Structures are given as structure tokens and as C-alpha cells.
Design a protein around this nucleic acid. Structure first.
Ligand SMILES: [K+]
Ligand SMILES: [K+]
Ligand SMILES: [K+]
Ligand SMILES: [Mg+2]
Ligand SMILES: [Mg+2]
Ligand SMILES: [Mg+2]
Ligand SMILES: [Mg+2]
Ligand SMILES: [Mg+2]
Ligand SMILES: [Mg+2]
Lengths: 254, 88, 224, 372, 253, 260
RNA sequence: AACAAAAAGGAUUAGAUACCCCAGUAGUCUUUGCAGACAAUUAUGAAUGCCAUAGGUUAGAUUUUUAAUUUAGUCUAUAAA
């Protein structure tokens, strides 16, 4: 069917993406009737409280609070599992990873691939990468688990900063020359999926809808896209409260 | 033994005489009268009864005809569905 | 070719060309039909192309020049063999009326044949035995005969309680002043009476035809 | 592995319709009528039903809605579909009440189906765990092969001279090599029974020439070989040297799925008269009087032989609605041809009065106006 | 879970695989009475008939709904046509939701190619973007060619090919329910499905009725904002030109 | 399918103040109404009664002898819920209109108390005691007490199962015994032949049940014990019940036409 | 034996070689040669590769031999053409 779609030369890229978006939504046989949103509600709320810091030490500290008995979050089973994972991940990778997630939010897409080319170059020289790959993939788990440069995160003192070394360009590594000079700070066309907090927020801060009326605003705007009612309903369960009673609903922040 | 064939496309599927064209009920009585005259004679007395039956025929009224049979209407509904088609 | 030339798949191409220019050369074209821009980006789908249909059963490998390649194939499931076995051992199970009318098509969402024959939404029927048998014959590794006997015996004990409850339910109702209407045994006989009479009238009126036509066969009209 | 559309159709209701089973077998060499056909012994198609709100619309879950004139008005909505769409673009259907209501009328008799007996009446249910079994082990011996009711091999006495030749040519002839192996497995039991009976004071099981001689030894005793041949081909027992091998095994379950009661050993507690001696009588219709000198009666839609004992001797056009007789259904069984045969017996006098009293037909009611 | 009057009282906006299967939309005709051209929509064979693929019916139905919604969004005249006996309540309800025309009796041959004879004395009216009747078109409505539908939704193409052939000549797009024996070349947008079931015809028709209703709502909402989603037709467009000419003639005089 | 619906004022959670413990009402309604509905579902799972309502199944399976077992579960579910639906968390003051008809028909509200309570114990069997409203086309509204047996229904459309008089201790050779026996066969014969004994109005507007008292053992055996020694038992159960009646709602459903 | 060009007779008819009738020889049949012309036709040379269906029918084959599937023939009615 995509092969049959013959656009006009004078159609903008927006019109072309709209024709393909409407064509993909015709072959949808519905989402599972019983499978529920995995990262939603309690777990989704916990992620926003535990992964909002700028230090992996504080993140793990917050997870221990959730896993503790009596935590009002109710995600004890989830928090305990994530902790058992982070301990196995490379401690250096966690610092470098958490650092780029905070910096990449202000980078351009073209500037991103250039910085990562420098970062990746530093990992080839590092010890964890060569050890993790040789121990897990080449050995297929044999010879026991991996052995990172620091045995754990406790070896890295608070004042230590093992990230800046990776975010510093190396003059011996030429800058990555891209195939074109295009770039942008945010995806120009990334609103063809389900509505997220950004979409629901804009609709609330713009209009004055209600609990049920707001859900129908998206179910109609997306022309019956499977999962909109479940997604919009979840977003309101977390980031929306009856600030005006049953009349309308606003965000919980303020 | 084979089964009935599937009729080819016809211009119209119908029966010629829908209602049975029954015969005059007395033409049989006259034959009986004519049968006695051949065996018992004309001016005989044995045929005196059959003659009375023959005279009773024409003195009685003619039964009214039956309503038309709607067979041909239903044959025309199922023609294309029962045969190989309909000729134009 | 008695058929006519249908160009329904090219209404847009034909309509858009007729609207491109004006018949009065030297003037701008008039406004096109209102539907032209509506289906501008919704072209028709390909038709009349014969694809290789879904093969519900393996095609004959020994065939060297196979025919009927573009012919849809028969849908067959492992349960077809089981349904035929059960309903042939229990022909009168077909007399129990079954409603094949669908309600919402969501029957298979509450069917967990690991529990037993009694499921949600569907009645206890020969289908339950086939589904229960198939589950045992696949999960518990039982054989066709072993799984058949198990699901088959569970099915009998349930039917027995259904028949024992009708009799007892009516017997106790009368012990406390409960009366009922006519039953099929009585209603069924009355219908036979009314139909038997119709036959008696036909036979009585049809026998008079033979005896009269028979006696009149001889030409005894002379009255000697 | 299957698309979501194909997954729904599989569990669909219309896809769960059972295939049309072959009709009840009749005399193969006997003549019949092909134009007209009456009710069959047992049903072959599934009876369908709808909701009262849907029947008024003609919707029966089929391809098209059915005509209202021939499907509305009656009490029990029942329909039999022969073809969901025929060459006339119509759903060839018929009423299913001839069998749908025959099942309800039979179950109203409240009688089980017992195993056929020979002529000490001992009515044994057909659902017993020792007799009602179909899964057997290769070690299954002969003494326990009579309890079964479902055999893979045919009944040699029931086949025609033509069907028997086709069987000998296409079923038993290409099984010679397999049968020789079946003997070797027995030899494994013959050489171990005598070699392991003294240890408490397996054999090679693969031979070529020893088998040829063992079979010759059995030529003096043909009975021990037939039991060995029948056990391999899974043939139903024929003669005693027990499980009613007269007419052959049943082509269906001994109950045929018409009744699932396992006994009639119970008493009916009457509201005023306490428990009863026998089950309530049932009125029957007389068909084909003696004057064949045997009479036929219609009980609950089934035809049976009249009681061993008038109205059943000579036809009487004066009787309205035909001659009718009150009787009691003693025993019900399913023969080898799939038919349901009832051993009817004449009903008592007082019982017919008790039954007529409830329905309001008794002339002199046994209660109130019965001084003696 | 099911009420026979549900497809009319509250038709669904979109049809799922379960709704289509429950409505008997997958039951084709006998395998012998099949148009081998439309073997592309057949899933298999069972019970002696052809089974239409549920995925194929759903995809084609969601596509037709888009066509109905856009034609109604651009101010087009739609015509729902179901002529079989028990299809009058279905077609009338669908046309009501979409603010369209209905036809439940035998189509008169020539009502499109010969509309001057058959639709000569039927009254019309001129309306603006808000469907408000405009005054001052009395001279136009008297000397005007009758209207033809901008879209035709046929619920039984097999039974009326005269209607569909006139749409092919008049260059009018059409939507049809194509059963296993129907020729798919008769319509522009096919909906492979059982056309003999009043339960499947009510679902398909109700879904297309919601599409038209959803399209009319957007057209009238854009009008309140002062945005017209259509342009004056060529018929009325010419009237404005010669109308100003008569005013231009009197301009000097 | 038929599913269990919540109670009036969260009786399942707290229960009545001094009539039934939260654990008793749980075993009486939740653990029983659910048990009846599970069996009711299996009987109508593939029939026309699959989506019909309880009262609709009652009137439709009243006379048919091949559906008496379906009637029991449908009638029991309807009668059981009818009992809890008329209970109040706090005693209610009897309205003036209802307080008048009760005195005019039964003489005094206290007389009606002993009549219903007396009938519950005098019946010696699980059943329901109803407060019926009878109004013939020509006669005025009149209240009476009807006592049904195990699962009998009071509605006139289901008179076939108006099980209100046992046959083991009411039909005998005594003078009054023979009279009951005659009425027994007169009903069975009239119902069988289709004739109607008591002409009724269309729509079953003759009898309109207003109040009910469930005397089954599962509702009081646990709370009020067996009753040995005069303490508790089925007697006290009927007494405490009389205090929690929703006379406000009872008067409503009665629809006593104003004529004062 | 029978049938039957020819020859001949009797009728019919305006006339009647004729059509009809009473009879009747070659010839048809057997064996051995000659002869080679036919609406010797499917008004269609033989052969090969290929193109979508439906309903019958003929001789098999396979199968859960009910009835389906399939190989090779033949006919009917259609699609694309
Ligand atoms: K001659
Ligand atoms: K001559
Ligand atoms: K052929
Ligand atoms: Mg059709
Ligand atoms: Mg010759
Ligand atoms: Mg030669
Ligand atoms: Mg020739
Ligand atoms: Mg040649
Ligand atoms: Mg030939």
C-alpha cells in the first residue's frame, strides 16, 4: 500500500508524512486487551523521583528508599530489582551515561553525533569496554562476570569526577565530518505516536477541558488511534488533579 | 443412473399449461350411453338408466374454474439461480 | 465482451484532468468538484491481481506440474478430526440446540481449558470436550484416546446432574403447592391426534376413489 | 504463527459447527426411496437456536437472515442448516424440531440406557468405568478386550462380500511384516516367563525362522490364533470362545448421547400418596396393528414393539386421533445400528388414574370421593 | 453484550476484528459462485463457502471511512444506497448522521446521466458555509442543472450496476460492499465483506455514518472560525459572473 | 453473564447495626448470591435467558416444568436481593399514609408485626414472608400477608410457583384437609388445561410486593444461632428485622393513592 | 429369404417421367482383384508452449473410500480476450 501512495511534487514534507501516518493506522488490529502500560502509574512516578538527580550516588540512594519497607510509593519489588541491575553495570558507564543525559538535553542533533564520536573514542581506550565485551560476548559469560576498573560505585569518592575526561575532545581524533550540514535542536516531526505529558499539558494549559472531556479531545484529534484513551488516562492519573473539583482538572505541580 | 442435468440458459422458464385443463365430466357419460346402444340396442330398456344420467349432465350447472396457478411467477424468480443463465 | 467498461478506479485521474484547463481557452479554469480535494491523497487499491493464496495445508511436494495455484485452500484445524470423533459417538448430542450467533466475538478471552469443561460465556457442549481434549493431548502429553476418555468422562458427570435436577426440581415444587403446565409428552401427543385425523379424512376420501373407480372399471352400464 | 484474524476465526462459533456425520446405516442390499425421506434414526446436523429478539429479525448467525414465515411463530426456535450457501444463493435449511423435541421428550421419560441383555434382568449402566473405556495399552490382554465398545477393526459378520474383499486386500494384506514383529514381541514373553519364573525360587525378541514354526504349531488349535490375530487387527469379538457379539459392536457410544442417567433405581415421592411403586406411565400411540402379526407403538416419538399381551389387534376408524395406550418404559438400549429400542410394558390401572388425576382427567378422583 | 438495535441507536465509530466477525462480515458465498478476480480478499474455504479475511475487511473499511469523512468535510453531497428489503432503517439512519441523501428503493436508470428528465422539478436551495439558506438565487434555482452526488455508498453493488455505471460515466467516486461474487471493478473503494447479512450491513453503514458525521462537525466548526473548507461550485460560480454583468450593464445605464 | 451487584449502604462492609454482623451479611449475600448466580449462569449460558433479567427469567420459567430448576436460582436471586434492598442502617419512622392503611387493614402495626413474625415461625421451613398489595379493578388497595416456600414468587405472572401451602401437613382426610386437597387438584387441573381460576389484570398489577422477610437458614443460623433455650434463633431474627424495615421505601413502593 | 436402381403395370393429375400402390432385375451378402471420386465435416491439417472459472459426464488413481483430491478424455455455460 505504501508503494501506491503517489504524492505531488508540490506537497510539503508535512503533507507527505500525514498521508503515510493515516495509511499505517489502517492496518492496525488493535492493542492487546489485557496487557497494561508497564511504565505507568506507580513505577512511572517512582522513575520521576529517583532518576531526577545529577549523581548516580543520589539515584541509588533514592531507590533504597523505595525498596525500604513502608515506602508509600508501593514499588518495593521494582526498586529492589533495579538496584540489583545497577550493581552489575559498569560504574564508569553510569557516570558517563547520566552525564550525557543532562547535557544532551541542550545539544543539537548534529552536534550530538560529533561529541559521541569523541566519547566513543575514549571508550575504545578505556579498560571497562574491552573487559565487558571480552567477558560477556567473546567469552559468552564464561570466566565469571566482568571486572570493571573500580570494583563498585563505593570506590569512587564523592569529589571524584570520572565524566569530564570523556566529554573533552581529543585533537588526535579528527572531528566527525557529517554527510550534510542539516541540524535541529528538536525533532521536527515526532508527534505521530501516542500523546505524552507534553501534549496533555499543552492541551490543559491552553484550554479548560474536564476529566472526561479532555480524554475525548485526543481520541477525536487522533481519529481513533489505538491506545490514546489508555495513554491520556494514565498521564492524568499522575500529572493531573482536580484543582477545581469535578469542574475541571489542572496539574499537580502548582 | 445419473442425476438431472442443469438446464442451459433459456429465454424463459415456465410451464405451458399451468392449470390442468380437465375434461368435460360428461363426455365419459355419453361414451357409456353409446356403449349400451352398441350392445343392448337403441330402443331397448337396459339403457334407460344411463340415458337419465346423460340427461342429468346438461341440467346441472358447470363448475366454476379454479384460480390461476402461480407456478410460472416462482419459476421466473429462480431461473438464473436454477439454470446456467437466461438467454437475451 | 458483454460487460461494460467500468472506469470507477480512475474517477480522480479523469476528473482532475477535465478540471486542469478551461474549455474556453484563454480563461482560468472554474472550481473543481468538491470531492476532488477530499480523496486527493487516498488513491484506490489494486484490484484483479491474483496472488499466491495462503496455504492452510502443505502443498503436495511430489507434484511436478501443479494446477490451481491461485485457488484459495481449505481451512483445517486439529480439532476437526476430534469433533468428528465425538459427534459420531454421540449423535444425539446434535439434538441439543446450540447458538452459533455471536454476541461480541470476545468468547475466547475467558476460555482457560486448564481448569475444566465449564468455561465462561459458552455452554457445556461437545465443543468443550474437544477443546479440553486438545489441551490435555498437547500440554499433559496424553494420547488421543487417553485425553479423549478423561474429558469425555468429565462431560458425562455434568450432564447427569443436569437431568437429575429437572426431575427433582419438579418433584419438590409440587410438595409445596407448585403446579406446572403441559409437558412435551402431552403436547406432542395432541399434535399427533390433530394430524392423524387429517390423514383419516384423506384415507377415507381416497379409498372411496379406488373402490368407485374399481367397480366402475367393468362396463356393467347395460343394467340387464 | 497465525494472523489475528485467523486466530479469531478458529475460536469462532460458526467454525465450531460439527461436520455432518454419516446417516444411520441401513440394509446395504435393500431398496429405498430417494425422492422422499422421513425423520432419521438419530440427528446428523446440529440444531441451531437464537434469541427471541434476533429471531423476529431473522438473524441466526448464518450468512443471511432466514425467512420469517418459516422460522417465526412456533414455540421452540430450532433449525437445521444443510448448506450455509447453496448454488441458488440461499441457505438450505429446515426445521430441527423433529429431533430437537424428540430429545426433550425422551429425557422426560427419566430412564437410563442399559447394556443389551440376553434371554434374571440386571440393568447395568453403560457409563461404568470398567466397560466404558477406549484407551488401551499394547499389554492389554484378551479377557479384558470384551469390556470395550470402540474397536478399530470392522465386524466381519456385518460386512458385505465386497467390503470384505476390499478389506482383505488393502488392510490385512500389507500388514504381514508388522504381524511377524507382533509375534516376536510375544516370544519375548514366552522365553522370559519360563526363564524368570525360577529366579525367585529380556530375550533378544528378534527372530526370523522361529516365528515360522510357532505359527505352524497353532494350526492344530485355531482358537488361540484368532485371539492373536483379532488382538492385532483390533477386531471385535465374534463368538464366546461374551459382550453381545450377536449383532456386533455399537457404531456409537452405547448411550449415543441421548441420556446420561446411570440408574432408574429411585422412587417418585407423590405429594399426597407418598412414594410410588413404579415410575409414572406414559401414553403411547398404536401404529401398524397386528392384523406381520406384530404391533408397533409410538412412545415419545420412538417406535417400539407393543407390550406382550382390542386396540392393538384391529384397526378402528371410529377412534378419534387413533388408538392410544398407557404403558411404562421398562428398559431402553441402543442397538448396533444406532437405533434406540425400548422394551415397553403395559401400565397398571391405578397408576394411570394417579397420573390422570394431576392433569385433571381422572373421572373418579382417588382423593376425597374414594370411600373404597 | 449484544442488542440487535445497537448498530442503529449507537453505531460504533470504528469496527474491530471482533465486531466484524460477530456481525458475520467474513461469510462469503459458495465457493462455486465466486468471482475469481476478488480472490485477493479470501482467507480460505470452510463450510463450503469462501471466508473473507477479517484483516482485509477492517483495513478497507477504515479507508472508506476516511473517504466519507473528507467528502463531508469538503461540503460534498453523499448518497447512501441500500435497496435490499431490510436495509431501509440502516440507510436512512446513516444518511441522517452524515447529513446526506438516502435511497432504499430501486434506482431509476438515468437519474444521473439523464438528471434533467428525472430530477427536473425537485426543489433545491442555496446555502452558505454555515448551511444557512441564502436569499437572492431565485433566478438561478429555476434555470439550473439538477444535482448529482459527490459520493455514493452502495450497500449491495451486485444488485444495482446501473447506478454504479452512471457514477463511472459521471466521474463520481463510489464505495461498495464487495462480496465474494461481486465484481470489484464496479466501485472506486471496495469493502470486501458479506453483503447478505443485515448485521454486517448495519455495522459497515453505521461506521460510515459516523465518518460523515465526524466530517460534518469539522466543516461547521471551521466555518465558525471563518474558514471555509470548500470553494463555490462551478455551477454557482458562473452565476456570479453573469450576475455582476447585469449589474455592470445597469452600472452605465 | 449475571454478576453480583453491591448492596444498599455498604452492608457488606459494615452491615446492619443490631440485625446482622458484617460477617453474617457477607455469608448471607456475597458468599451466597454469588453461589446462586454461578449456578444460574451455567443454566442460561447458551439460551435466550443469557441476557435477560432475574425477574424476566422468573415470569418466563414459571409454568414450564422443564425449567423449574432455572426458576429456583432466578427466583432465589430476586427474592434474596429484595430482602436486603428494604433494610435501613437506622430505624425509620413509619409514614402517616402507610400507618393508616396498616391499621385499617390489620388493625394495628403491632398486629401486623405478630402476623408476619408468627407466620415465619409457623411455616417451619425456609421461605419468604411477603407484604402484598392487592387492588382489583373495582376494589380499593388492600394489604395482606403472603408466605411463600423455598423459592416461590408472589407475582401473579408466576402463580404457577406461588408455593404458599405445604402438601405434607395441609392435605388430609379431615374436614379442612379435604378442602385443601380439592383446591390442590383444582389448581393443577386448571393450570394444566390452561384455564385461569382467579381473573387477573393485565401487567400483573394485582399483587405488588412491598416488603419481604428471608427465613432461610443461611441468613440467621450463624448470627442468631440455632435458638435453643428461647435465646436468639429464628424468633429473635424476625423481631430484630422488624426494627430495621425501611418504612420510607416500603410506603413508596406501596403507592397508596391519597384519598383522605 | 428380404429389400430394391432398371424395365413394366395400376392410380393420381390439366398433363405425371415422378411422389403413392401391385409386382420386380441388377445390386446389397460370400471369396479374389480392379477402381480411388464423398457434406471422406468439427464446413476448423498435424504438433508444441501457454491463459481464469463453473456445472455435467467417461476410464482410473488416492483418501478420514461419506465425499473429496487428482491424471487423461468429452460436452454445456461463462470471464479475460
Ligand atoms: K418390393
Ligand atoms: K407409372
Ligand atoms: K471435465
Ligand atoms: Mg451476496
Ligand atoms: Mg460391404
Ligand atoms: Mg487399391
Ligand atoms: Mg462418410
Ligand atoms: Mg498432414
Ligand atoms: Mg464421445
Amino acid at each position: 500500500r505504501l508503494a501506491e501512495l503517489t504524492p505531488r511534487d508540490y506537497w510539503t514534507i508535512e503533507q507527505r508524512l500525514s498521508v503515510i501516518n493515516d495509511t499505517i493506522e489502517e492496518f492496525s488490529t488493535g492493542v492487546p486487551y489485557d496487557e497494561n502500560i508497564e511504565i505507568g502509574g506507580k513505577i512511572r512516578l517512582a522513575i520521576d523521583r529517583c532518576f531526577k538527580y545529577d549523581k548516580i550516588d543520589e539515584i541509588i540512594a533514592a531507590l533504597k528508599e523505595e525498596a525500604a519497607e513502608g515506602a508509600k510509593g508501593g514499588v518495593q519489588s521494582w526498586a529492589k530489582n533495579t538496584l540489583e541491575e545497577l550493581t552489575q553495570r559498569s560504574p564508569t558507564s553510569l557516570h558517563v551515561t547520566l552525564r550525557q543525559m543532562r547535557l544532551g538535553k541542550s545539544w543539537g542533533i548534529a552536534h550530538t553525533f560529533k561529541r559521541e564520536h569523541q566519547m566513543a573514542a575514549k571508550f575504545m581506550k578505556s579498560h571497562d569496554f574491552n573487559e565487558g565485551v571480552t567477558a560477556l560476548l567473546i567469552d559468552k559469560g564464561a570466566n565469571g562476570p566482568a571486572k570493571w576498573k573500580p570494583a563498585s560505585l563505593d570506590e569512587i569518592p564523592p569529589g571524584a569526577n570520572i565524566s569530564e575526561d570523556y566529554f573533552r575532545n581529543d585533537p588526535e581524533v579528527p572531528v566527525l565530518e557529517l554527510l550534510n550540514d542539516r541540524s535541529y535542536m528538536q525533532y521536527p516531526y515526532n508527534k505521530f505516536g501516542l500523546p505524552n505529558d507534553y501534549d496533555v499539558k499543552e492541551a490543559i494549559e491552553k484550554g479548560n477541558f474536564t476529566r472526561e472531556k479532555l480524554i475525548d479531545h485526543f481520541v477525536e484529534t487522533r481519529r481513533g488511534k489505538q491506545g490514546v484513551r489508555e495513554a491520556v488516562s494514565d498521564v492524568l492519573d499522575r500529572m493531573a488533579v482536580r484543582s477545581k473539583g469535578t469542574e475541571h482538572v489542572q496539574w499537580k505541580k502548582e | 443412473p445419473n442425476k438431472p442435468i442443469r438446464l442451459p440458459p433459456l429465454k424463459q422458464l415456465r410451464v405451458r399449461q399451468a392449470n390442468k385443463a380437465e375434461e368435460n365430466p360428461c363426455i365419459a357419460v355419453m361414451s357409456s350411453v353409446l356403449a349400451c346402444w352398441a350392445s343392448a340396442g337403441y330402443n331397448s330398456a337396459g339403457c334407460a338408466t344411463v340415458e337419465n344420467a346423460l340427461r342429468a349432465c346438461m341440467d346441472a350447472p358447470k363448475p366454476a374454474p379454479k384460480p390461476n396457478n402461480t407456478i410460472n411467477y416462482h419459476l421466473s424468480r429462480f431461473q438464473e439461480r436454477l439454470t446456467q443463465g437466461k438467454s437475451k | 465482451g458483454k460487460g461494460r467498461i467500468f472506469q470507477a478506479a480512475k474517477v480522480y485521474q479523469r476528473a482532475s484532468e477535465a478540471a486542469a484547463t478551461n474549455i474556453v481557452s484563454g480563461l482560468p479554469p472554474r472550481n473543481p468538484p468538491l470531492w476532488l480535494k477530499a480523496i486527493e491523497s487516498i488513491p484506490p487499491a489494486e484490484i484483479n491481481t491474483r496472488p499466491y493464496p495462503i496455504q492452510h495445508s502443505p502443498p503436495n511436494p511430489r507434484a511436478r506440474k501443479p494446477r490451481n495455484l491461485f485457488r484459495p485452500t481449505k481451512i483445517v484445524y486439529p480439532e476437526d478430526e476430534l469433533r468428528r470423533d465425538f459427534y459420531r459417538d454421540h449423535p444425539w448430542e446434535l439434538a441439543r440446540p446450540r447458538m452459533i450467533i455471536e454476541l461480541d466475538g470476545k468468547d475466547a478471552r475467558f476460555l482457560d481449558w486448564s481448569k475444566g469443561l465449564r468455561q465462561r460465556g459458552i455452554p457445556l457442549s461437545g465443543e468443550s470436550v474437544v477443546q479440553r481434549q486438545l489441551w490435555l493431548m498437547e500440554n499433559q502429553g496424553m494420547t488421543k484416546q487417553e485425553a479423549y476418555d478423561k474429558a469425555r468422562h468429565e462431560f458425562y458427570k455434568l450432564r447427569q446432574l443436569e437431568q437429575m435436577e429437572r426431575r427433582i426440581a419438579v418433584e419438590e415444587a409440587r410438595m409445596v403447592g407448585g403446579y406446572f403446565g403441559k409437558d412435551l409428552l402431552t403436547v406432542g401427543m395432541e399434535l399427533e391426534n390433530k394430524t392423524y385425523e387429517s390423514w383419516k379424512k384423506w384415507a377415507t376420501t381416497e379409498i372411496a376413489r379406488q373402490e368407485s373407480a374399481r367397480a366402475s372399471m367393468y362396463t356393467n352400464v347395460v343394467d340387464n | 504463527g497465525v494472523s489475528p484474524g485467523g486466530a479469531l476465526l478458529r475460536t469462532s462459533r460458526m467454525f465450531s459447527l460439527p461436520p455432518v456425520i454419516p446417516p444411520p446405516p441401513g440394509n446395504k442390499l435393500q431398496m429405498i426411496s430417494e425422492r422422499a425421506s422421513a425423520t432419521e434414526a438419530y440427528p446428523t446436523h446440529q440444531v441451531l437456536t437464537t434469541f427471541e429478539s434476533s429471531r423476529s429479525r431473522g438473524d441466526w448467525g448464518l450468512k443471511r437472515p432466514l425467512p420469517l414465515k418459516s422460522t417465526t411463530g412456533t414455540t421452540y426456535p430450532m433449525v437445521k442448516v444443510k448448506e450455509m450457501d447453496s448454488l441458488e444463493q440461499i441457505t438450505d435449511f429446515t426445521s430441527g424440531t423433529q429431533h430437537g423435541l424428540t430429545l426433550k421428550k425422551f429425557q422426560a421419560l427419566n430412564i437410563p440406557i442399559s447394556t443389551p441383555s440376553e434371554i434374571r434382568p440386571v440393568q447395568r449402566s453403560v457409563f461404568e468405568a470398567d466397560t466404558d473405556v477406549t484407551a488401551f495399552s499394547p499389554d492389554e490382554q484378551i479377557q479384558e478386550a470384551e469390556k470395550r465398545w470402540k474397536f478399530s477393526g470392522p465386524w466381519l459378520a456385518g460386512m458385505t462380500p465386497g467390503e470384505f474383499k476390499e478389506y482383505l486386500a488393502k488392510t490385512v494384506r500389507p500388514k504381514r511384516a508388522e504381524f511377524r514383529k507382533f509375534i516376536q514381541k510375544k516370544i519375548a514373553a514366552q522365553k522370559t516367563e519360563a526363564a524368570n519364573r525360577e529366579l525367585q525360587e529380556k530375550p533378544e525378541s528378534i527372530t526370523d525362522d522361529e516365528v515360522t514354526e510357532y505359527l505352524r504349531r497353532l494350526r492344530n488349535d485355531n482358537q488361540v490364533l484368532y485371539d492373536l490375530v483379532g488382538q492385532f487387527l483390533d477386531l471385535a469379538p465374534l463368538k464366546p470362545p461374551s459382550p453381545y457379539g450377536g449383532r456386533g459392536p455399537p457404531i456409537t457410544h452405547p448411550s449415543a448421547g441421548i441420556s446420561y442417567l446411570r440408574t432408574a433405581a429411585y422412587l417418585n415421592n407423590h405429594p399426597i400418596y407418598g412414594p410410588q411403586k413404579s415410575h409414572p406411565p406414559v401414553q403411547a400411540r398404536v401404529l401398524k396393528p397386528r392384523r406381520g402379526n406384530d404391533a408397533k407403538i409410538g412412545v415419545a416419538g420412538f417406535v417400539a414393539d407393543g407390550p406382550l399381551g382390542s386396540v392393538m389387534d384391529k384397526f378402528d376408524p371410529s377412534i378419534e386421533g387413533g388408538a392410544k395406550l398407557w404403558v411404562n418404559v421398562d428398559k431402553a438400549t441402543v442397538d448396533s445400528t444406532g437405533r434406540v429400542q425400548l422394551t415397553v410394558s403395559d401400565a397398571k390401572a391405578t397408576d394411570v388414574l394417579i397420573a390422570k388425576e394431576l392433569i385433571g382427567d381422572a373421572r373418579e378422583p382417588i382423593f376425597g370421593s374414594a370411600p373404597k | 453484550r449484544y442488542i440487535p438495535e445497537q448498530y442503529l441507536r449507537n453505531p460504533p465509530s470504528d469496527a474491530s476484528l471482533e465486531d466484524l466477525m460477530a456481525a458475520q462480515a467474513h461469510m462469503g458465498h459458495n465457493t462455486s459462485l465466486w468471482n475469481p478476480a476478488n480472490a485477493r480478499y479470501i482467507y480460505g474455504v470452510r463450510q463450503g463457502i469462501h471466508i473473507i479475511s477479517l484483516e482485509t475487511t477492517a483495513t478497507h473499511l477504515r479507508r472508506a471511512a476516511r473517504v466519507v469523512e473528507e467528502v463531508a468535510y469538503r461540503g460534498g453531497l453523499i448518497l447512501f444506497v441500500g435497496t435490499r428489503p431490510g436495509q431501509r432503517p440502516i440507510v436512512v439512519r446513516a444518511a441522517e448522521l452524515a447529513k446526506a441523501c438516502h435511497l432504499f428503493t430501486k434506482w431509476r436508470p438515468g437519474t444521473i446521466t439523464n438528471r434533467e428528465q428525472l430530477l427536473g422539478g425537485v426543489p433545491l436551495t442555496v446555502v452558505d458555509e454555515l448551511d444557512r439558506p441564502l436569499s437572492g438565487f431565485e433566478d438561478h434555482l429555476h434555470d439550473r442543472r439538477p444535482l448529482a452526488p459527490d459520493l455514493v455508498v452502495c450497500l449491495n453493488p451486485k444488485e444495482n450496476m446501473t447506478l454504479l455505471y452512471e457514477c463511472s460515466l459521471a466521474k463520481i467516486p463510489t464505495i461498495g460492499i464487495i462480496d465474494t461474487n461481486t465484481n470489484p471493478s464496479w466501485v472506486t473503494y471496495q469493502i470486501p465483506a458479506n453483503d447478505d447479512s443485515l448485521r454486517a450491513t448495519a455495522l459497515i453503514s453505521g461506521v460510515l455514518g459516523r465518518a460523515g458525521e465526524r466530517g460534518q462537525k469539522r466543516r461547521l466548526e471551521a466555518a465558525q472560525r471563518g474558514v471555509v473548507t470548500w470553494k463555490t461550485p462551478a455551477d454557482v460560480q458562473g452565476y456570479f459572473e453573469l450576475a455582476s454583468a447585469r449589474a455592470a450593464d445597469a452600472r452605465r445605464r | 453473564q449475571h454478576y453480583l451487584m453491591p448492596l444498599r449502604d455498604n452492608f457488606e462492609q459494615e452491615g446492619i447495626r443490631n440485625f446482622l454482623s458484617p460477617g453474617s451479611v457477607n455469608m448471607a449475600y456475597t458468599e451466597y448470591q454469588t453461589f446462586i448466580l454461578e449456578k444460574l449462569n451455567a443454566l442460561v449460558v447458551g439460551t435466550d435467558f443469557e441476557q435477560k433479567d432475574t425477574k424476566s427469567i422468573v415470569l418466563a420459567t414459571a409454568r414450564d416444568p422443564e425449567l423449574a430448576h432455572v426458576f429456583n436460582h432466578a427466583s432465589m436471586a430476586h427474592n434474596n436481593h429484595f430482602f436486603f434492598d428494604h433494610l435501613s442502617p437506622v430505624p425509620v419512622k413509619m409514614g402517616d399514609k402507610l400507618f393508616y392503611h396498616i391499621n385499617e387493614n390489620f388493625g394495628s402495626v403491632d398486629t401486623l408485626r405478630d402476623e408476619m413474625i408468627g407466620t415465619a415461625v409457623s411455616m417451619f421451613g425456609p421461605g419468604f414472608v411477603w407484604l402484598v398489595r392487592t387492588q382489583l379493578p373495582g376494589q380499593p388497595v388492600a394489604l395482606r400477608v403472603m408466605a411463600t416456600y423455598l423459592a416461590g414468587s408472589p407475582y401473579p405472572g408466576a402463580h404457577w410457583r406461588r408455593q404458599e401451602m405445604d402438601a405434607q401437613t395441609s392435605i388430609g382426610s379431615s374436614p379442612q384437609g379435604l378442602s385443601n386437597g380439592q383446591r390442590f387438584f383444582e389448581r393443577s387441573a386448571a393450570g394444566f388445561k390452561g384455564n385461569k381460576l382467579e381473573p387477573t389484570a393485565p401487567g400483573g398489577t394485582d399483587l405488588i410486593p412491598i416488603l419481604c422477610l428471608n427465613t432461610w437458614e443461611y441468613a440467621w443460623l450463624r448470627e442468631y444461632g440455632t435458638g435453643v433455650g428461647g435465646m436468639g434463633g429464628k424468633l429473635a431474627y424476625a423481631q430484630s428485622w422488624w426494627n430495621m424495615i425501611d418504612w420510607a421505601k416500603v410506603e413508596e413502593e406501596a403507592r397508596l393513592e391519597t384519598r383522605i
